[model samples]
Target chain A: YSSNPTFYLGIDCIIFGFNEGEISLLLLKRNFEPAMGEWSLMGGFVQKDESVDDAAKRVLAELTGLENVYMEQVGAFGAIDRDPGERVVSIAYYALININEYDRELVQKHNAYWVNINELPALIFDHPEMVDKAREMMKQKASVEPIGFNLLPKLFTLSQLQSLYEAIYGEPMDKRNFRKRVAEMDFIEKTDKIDKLGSKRGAALYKFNGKAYRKDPKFKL
Target chain B: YSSNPTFYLGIDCIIFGFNEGEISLLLLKRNFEPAMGEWSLMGGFVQKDESVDDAAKRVLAELTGLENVYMEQVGAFGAIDRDPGERVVSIAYYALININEYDRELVQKHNAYWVNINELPALIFDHPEMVDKAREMMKQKASVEPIGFNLLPKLFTLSQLQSLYEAIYGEPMDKRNFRKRVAEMDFIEKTDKIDKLGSKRGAALYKFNGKAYRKDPKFKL
Candidate 1:
């Protein structure tokens, strides 16, 4: 056994939101010491009996009042000097939930909002790094799973889906070629409803066909 | 804040070892702690003054006397009661090292061995899950970088390289096809050195040509 042990562990959540063809992260203004007046990822300490996953979910539920959000562990960050107060170890996660699912009114009440990923304001501690990782994961998992749809509503136009990827990657792609690649995956089911708001000619809407892709190797769009 | 606060923190390592064609991992006996006498990945605490990365490197160096090993954060594990002791969060990383460079004598002293990943024993905590995730990362990264070579000596023959991958994935591959694929990548530099000890016919040896790959993709072998 060894001596001079250290404690002070915490969990931070990187909540990503996709809206208006832009990638944004949900951040909370710190309410306590260490980062008292700065913006930080939504976080909390782990309780003796609650697991880190539970703590993360609980933190999200308490702060955002959203339950059953899709959450996954990203990585742990413990740079000896990452925390200013003392030696603090933070386990960070990237969570995906439909942007339309959250109560926007509640978020405004609590001073939480989506900030653009590229133009993020300075964050507390090593939070900027944590958010960066979450963004990377979002990109990697974009074509692998139906993770991109988490940012938009259950039903969306084809253009909206393509725009979501463009927003996530922050790059221009050949729109026709991109559509062809996504259509080849056969993961999107065309819906009966048509989107009439965006253009004079109505565009057909589509929803993710998760079951079809579950049996397939790769998913696009 | 709600009452009942406790944290479950764990440590997991992405131990990398290179053999004939694939990689290897080191698992140790838990000898102590909450999960006594069970096989576990080598890990430990985050001191008050030390960052999480520092804790990871400290544990690796202390246990294996390995310094300057390739270590990168992978993900975090949080399950409400994943740990029996408390609601612990585990930070995981994938470490790449030329295992042949390790002190073999010291490894024997510590009773840790390079085990083929497929033949791994059950691990304590959520370590199995951590390994599963790391394995996925390894597969994804294996093609991008020559990290698989870390298991073998500085110079090796093509047969030895094929064996390493077979050992890693536990799947037989077409040698001719794999060799062609690797040659196309233009990643290896053939040398005059030959291995003649085992067979009557000698096979030419090769070393990694990492300059261009590193310059282009910042790859690590």
Candidate 2:
């Protein structure tokens, strides 16, 4: 290992969560200088021993106290002056997690808050571009496959699933058409267990069949 | 511009070319001490002034003598010992180009060669992974949209278009079905000019409708 002008490398994450019918983004108030008191996607600099992939997972776990969450790399942002404090090459990663699962105490310890994605405050540096890239990727990805299932509980009703898709696409859909398409998805299994928490008699519950999806791999909604 | 650990960031490009139904990859023999004489994706270290995006464009243009080609970022690769010489964080980029457009003299000056993607030689470091990632992206991308048009000339026959898709997918599709799908694509425009190069008969020509594709934006082939 010789020298070739190494600059600081940072890993920033766009943590997404879905609650009710709205999508929330996790942001932190940076305690460090140069952007102190400004909001940023939860992030940190990579150390000597870890790869960017590992660093992303560690940063996510440290901030949210969750592991094995669905995470993916958005891309690398290497603008020379994107970070006014240092010449940093930042890689952006995004995660989809259930809103109720993250440890609120740990998030508070990191000075983080989950804000509705539509009403986001201005973020530091080029973090806004990162957010937009992840959102666009998520929308395209959700259209071709079932990935937003990670943002829901193990068992969810059809209404909740429709709401999640509506929130992701930022549009309303015809309920009859939506269920008709969902009915054709062999990867979604209607579970025997039904939810009786409401005053009514029956609310059908469904579970995403990952094994089936993995085998068949064709879902266009 | 102040304090954090700095490391060398590199950009490696997986330049793809399609000719006669076979895909070729552009590679160069490394002339440096670390992996001299070994095959590697065309790449270079990012400088203090340029962004990684700019660096990718510059490095690509330096080797191919082609500007404004279609290029996209694959992802970032970072491992502690990925490079024998140093800890390098490499961003992988992919470009699709018409093989005849590149200046062979400039490529020769850089000691680069075009090899069949299926018969690629052993590459240095994690360069093989970079090629795989780009190919997978290209296949998925080609399925959803009409991007392999970059691998063809301005005017091409329907057979050449079919050959391009077969090469990218590594499988043969029915010609009738292929032409039927192409017929439905309003973005693919038929040209009045006919090619009589092979025989006395005529072979119809077509051009990619960039304006129409930009406006309509739906091609799932």
Candidate 3:
């Protein structure tokens, strides 16, 4: 754009999804890379006219065929040798998507696969480190912010919410106590629908109340 | 390097300092256009051979004439029009340096000035937004991590520690309760030295125990 030296700028997305109490990452099999055929976070070069946030959204939309997903810029990954084939400085953005809402056919078409966090395959380049940072961000964010709601379906049970937190923290939380805390936050309200998927007695569904969530600044899971 | 599109990459640093219970930012008076002579974050273009972190350290060293200062990558600031003269994707970094350690002559030579956060002048480009993000990061970090010690001299009193928190949070903290909380954390140990500058009676000094800080994941002020 000016006379300054130029370098490659890219956006790498750490797409996180939670389903049935399990957290997973959406990784692509890089068909054209220095390390071709290796698993990597889905990414794309920034267009000349777009902001990095727009670029990240473009990359995510291209693969998932979804828009308006909850996303955050984790940081920049710009070690001089972080990229093998080029001197590329990539912005790492982590996004939370409801696994149920994503287009399954679009994901399959993009040659992307969702791998459980515990079962993730080694990624190419410094992507493994990027994933680690993204995981750390997710843990801190979900612990303090109600952003974890993006990972769950619109209508979810209290038990399901607890499961999501447990998966995020990699530990078990007492169900009774978790529910007590959740109730205190007042961010979720019961709905008429009932979920009998895993319980013998139907569990009531709840929806997130964004207005109430904003009232408390120190709300935690 | 690969044959991909390229852009200007730079690092913008928000240098935060704590002095006499007030939070201040070290900002540069830009010497060249797009916004010559205007207040701006201290920053530099990334060298071809050095990593962004290295570049941040280099910029800080150039301005402060001090090395090994505590710094963190805040995030990327990549709005398309962030820089009027070029398409610059800037990685924002926040650094905490002991206010008393910086060479005053070097700062004067660099034409940089430390302004209180409350009284900062209008800044260039997206620097104002960068400062807001950096302030938010500082609050989160000072609350949960012992990184705030980097902004204090090697030896400090309990009142000074409480003041640092009070400055970061922009409020007064209960001295007794704050001292009790500090005692429970066990991250600072008393030293024999005392300082009588600010108090009628000398106040005992303490040194931060780095080893103890890492033992707990949930340490808070």
Candidate 4:
């Protein structure tokens, strides 16, 4: 351990939020050198007191002021020349939160804005690559797992949930095909009430059945 | 990156292999301090010239002497107190190699042995947890991904592939149920061949169709 070199370890939060049936990623003004004012994921260096995971939580909270968010590791971005200004290994963690649940002041406080993922600006360093892989991870997990509940309001219209998939897949889904897939996911429960927010005719409301999603005889993965 | 902290970054290769209807993990006897005798994943410090991904490839080759195998990031294990002797963040990568294809001399040189994953010995630091997560990653991946080709003989029996799943899932699978799922994977091409080594009549052989797997309309994940 004595002879080995140490590298600056950092965590980049790929903050994902859902608002009005649309997917958005949180990006911030780059406050550091070599790429001033360029957009980047919320970034911070791991301090001596915190591990990279804890550093991720700290940095996430510093921006969102919310704990227990659906946070997870996306991947490690460690190109030798990635940092440009310095050599560092930054681990990317993706967090999913309903847009209205967090403190907007924190978002404004950090010069961060939740922009539509499709309208993303060029990000600094390998952040563009980070967001790229994060998209795949989100798509993969969302395919089999009911983790989308974290990104939407508790009571959401089925159409809103379908829109959430559109946000991750980067494409609009077929109504019939999407509805059939949703039909198979028993965890998605229908509410008797309806919503007319985005339609001439009301849309059926749905809620995620957390207990049903985790019951025994669960499918592998 | 200045006033903050930098830590020793290392790569731990969770090299997994399959041979003769069984899955095994490559475990090494830790050579350096602080736990010399206990088992650990093949680990090495990321060198100045290489990124962590390259470091993972290097460390894996150091033990198995193989390249072009299926290798991927598992996750980062970064508890502040994870390493008792020092503060280091170790990234874990799982490399799947066919058991019969690696250099035996390299294995003996590194004091590593391929042990059954189900019968793993206690590992040092958070390596045990690393293996645990590695298993989940493998299971999650093997669910829909045709990555088992990396772990088995290029030409293998359907039963052999089933056993590979059992190895990661830590339980036996119902053959009928397993075949139904494999039936949906159009990429699993059935060859007009049979193997009598471990069967009464003979088991039909199968091969993975890489081209077919990558064609458009690919399932997410």
Candidate 5:
């Protein structure tokens, strides 16, 4: 009795990029019908030979020309009328990438653009819900893990890190209190380097100490 | 134009039960071919018109005869060779049920049994991974939210709550520290009744105040 009805499977990527004290979403301008030319998350049908995870990376790389990005599965979105054209179940993924690392030309060529998360337009289908879920995941993760560092450069100032988190939270945080909380975490080590830009007094740069973070069993920030 | 290949969609559940100071899993003794009679999670193919969430709830009810259970979607598992029999993509869900609430006769009649989570036998396909992921999710969520209450009876002692958390974590915790931490949270209110069965001094019973928790903006445990 292998007569199970088949359904279309799809993977949607909600790529979040952080830069210039703001968080942005990498969205694609659809070139096909069924909400053509509208903003949508980069997505594609799962091919027979690939897993859903591979499909997500492939879709992200096809549009952004970046591979090995930090990605996490948000959840499966499967409403009966989620898609007006077909009954498709989509597995949504949220990815964090340094904004300056992606190829701008490749993104533009693929009709994809980075839009500030705060100024996002109405997305097609159930993508808005997907973005909301991704934002929630990002906030929840950034609070506990050091995943928010993925959105920043290898070397960045403490103010930049605080700004990145503030952008993710979509609110203003006390600079002093934020630094105090971050300073207690051994995973983040201060570097002698300083940044003259973005402030008058200049902020010291820091790098994520992955080794120390991994070895320190009591670390949680 | 519809030449896309179709695949079978199935739902596998990781049912966690807590009782007697230990966490357990509800597994099925398969009576059919393909790892037949071996330990396996209760699963079924999704019906044509049902959503994945509905399929999970239905699968749980069909096997255990329990409805309105606490369940959460773990994630989707899609490996081409995951199932030796066919190419099937299964949506994984984790359900938490009070151990005493389930009908033991129905469970045995369906060839299903509850086994300790730590002593789980060989499961079919990628079910083991599903169980691990579900446990991880449970630990992560229970750390931030009051979801551990779902595994206990309506009225429970503070020690019972601590035991539930200990079962989820599979570790012993400090009694005074655990109670002190839980007592600070506004969501839990002490009742006039005492549970004499669990303690020699008759520990006071406490109930989770969902309404107060929802209304209070700063409530976090």
Candidate 6:
């Protein structure tokens, strides 16, 4: 018989970032055995007294020191030999957060960095597959819901928004048409302040109307 | 050290069917301990050597004796003390099969019957929650894809098709508009034979055009 039984439950966080006008994911270096020192998504085993959602949030906080960020469950991975050490099944969740919105100076203090999704490094176990599925769901969701706005500053320009969508789909969308479509939906509001960070033209800033969108009959972005 | 360590993995199947002009589910009679004789979705613990998917298929086949059934993983359910016997975590899969296309007599022989979506009995543990979520997904899916056709016969009347939609949505729909919309979609082909079985006006018969729809980009059935 096997030496002992292990109640292995893991949580894989699909952390999304908007960098270089594109949606990306963050990966961390595994500091322990089984896949030691190799790049993996920030994850950890579930504690004895916490729910899956709690475990996911805890894992995100422990690794990146970020707490109470946007997160949601994706699905579970349950292959017999998915984990070489034992029969460990993992529940996957995705978190969509603005890349530079967090404490930039604090994040730079850790071993995490934003990597281009198209140029992702090899991940341990089925981490890559989990992230791929989560990303697909994020796109499907962002098409209808304002969840994707969590990946941008509270105030942003129409040009920045259009460029973000283009980079996300990896295809050049009609910029004017995209702006007209999103604006007609009436979820974003023009802000008093303008963005003076990028260029001399200084594009006007816009903020997402969270309260109005939430109460709308059709809460679409 | 701790006491005897036994970790169990279970598979819960949300099997869907369409019968008697209503969308329904295939529930099971629990013959094992913990929830013996309760009305529950067909489920079983994953064997040591079998894959999770294989375990789900086996349990479904054992209960209904139905072969080549369509199914996919929905999500996982893991809560401490969820099972009475041991610490068991269950993963669920949603299956769509046409009862009219399968061996009805065999299903009845195995003591399984179709229960209407709204009339489902109290299931064991979190099995009821699993079924509720699966039914919600199926309703959403029926709009875009023709997966609902899997729960129908090879040839059906326009009224029969419309009834299935109403059953799924749990509301009465405008018949003329429904027929016109589906007919204009051109995904269904008119058949030569009419269903004279308990017919008053000799309703027209039609079959889903699988080949044409599969080859085209648009599948609006």
Which model scores highest in TM-score? 3
TM-score, chain B, predicted structure 3? 0.93
Misplaced by over 4 Å in model 5 are A180-187, A190-204, A217-221, B1-3, B180-187, B191-204, B217-221
Model 5 agreement with the true structure over B61-164: per-residue lDDT tens digits: 98888898889999989888888888888999999888888887878777998899999999988999999999998898887777778888888987788888
Model 3 chain B lDDT-worst window of ten: B211-220
Isolated chain B TM-score per model: 0.83, 0.94, 0.93, 0.88, 0.93, 0.87
The lDDT per prediction is 0.74, 0.89, 0.86, 0.83, 0.84, 0.75
Per-residue CA lDDT of candidate 2, range A34-117, in tens?
A: 788999998877788888889999999999999998998999999988988668889999999988898989988889998999
All-Cα superposition RMSD per candidate: 3.1, 2.5, 2.1, 3.9, 2.8, 3.9
Number of colliding residue pairs in each model:
28, 6, 0, 0, 0, 0
Instruction: Give one digit per residue, the lDDT tens place, for model 3 in B1-221.
Output: 34456889888889999888788999888776667889998888887889888989998888888798899998888898998877888988999999888889878876888899989999988999999998988888778788999999999999888888888888998888888887776768888999889557888999887877667545778
**lDDT of each residue in B122-143, candidate 4, tens digit only:** 9888998888888888888776
Q: Which ten residues in a row have the lowest lDDT in candidate 2 chain B?
A: B1-10
lDDT of 1 by residue, A1-221 (tens): 23445356677889888887887888877556666778988877766666667878887876678887788777677776787665567778788877778877767765787888888889978888888777777787775677777777888987888888888878877888977876776767787998788567788888877788787857655
Best by lDDT: 2
Candidate 1 CAPRI category: medium
TM-score between model 3 and native: 0.95
Which DockQ values do the candidates obtain, in the order shown? 0.52, 0.64, 0.65, 0.70, 0.54, 0.33
Candidate 2 docking class: medium
Arrange candidates by lDDT, descending.
2, 3, 5, 4, 6, 1
TM-score of chain A of 2: 0.94
Kindly report the docking quality category of candidate 5: medium
**Deviation of model 6 at A166, angstroms:** 2.7
